[model samples]
Target: SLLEFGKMILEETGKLAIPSYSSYGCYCGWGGKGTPKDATDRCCFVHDCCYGNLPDCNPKSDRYKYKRVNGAIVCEKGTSCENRICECDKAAAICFRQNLNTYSKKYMLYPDFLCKGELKC
Candidate 1:
């Protein structure tokens, strides 16, 4: 799996939800109430929608290659959907950095609420 590079991307990007957030909004692990808790959460919300528009492009399904360069994960050139998926993550990552003030430990947990999940594909 590409978990290693995914983790690095999350770390370099900025903390959002561990593994991932829910379809609704802001909820730490999975499923939410459709309301973002803050700017950072909004970043994730937009990201979710971005992927939803792409066919079969969620983190768990995409198998794009990535590598570390100077402490950052660099996504290799890939399929059309893969390219946009990368952009979605890239945009959300930048958004997280832009709103780091709202970073909360609440989102760093797993869907099981134990902080065990890591992003993968």
Candidate 2:
């Protein structure tokens, strides 16, 4: 299992059902308890791992690593169905989370997701 790193994702809808993971460490996404959105979570992670030193996000942190979850259909808000191809499920339009409890996703897929300096990916 990879060292989990998660950013707070809160449900603005106020009643959106939250999500969780069975990995060894931190795991969260848009919904209850507070977090951005699902894509919001991935965007934060992409930058924290792919990008170099920056502001609040740090890739060099010991807790950083790609958490691969299976059957994940990930996509940032307003993202087009064709924005990034999920070869695993060509018919589907979402991002895949590669978690240990499940089988491997099609690939180490990280879309050209959120990356805006302060709140980067």
RMSD of each: 7.3, 15.9
lDDT of 2 by residue, 28-53 (tens): 22112222234534433443333333
State each candidate's clash count. Answer: 1, 19
* Decoy 2 TM-score against native: 0.17
| Colliding residue pairs in candidate 1 | 110-115
lDDT of 1 by residue, 27-71 (tens): 333443445666766776676666657866565466565555785
The list of candidate 1 runs beyond 4 A from truth reads 1-5, 13-28, 56-59, 66-75, 106-121
* Runs in model 2 lying further than 4 Å from the true structure: 1-8, 12-44, 55-121
Error of 2 at 35 (Å): 23
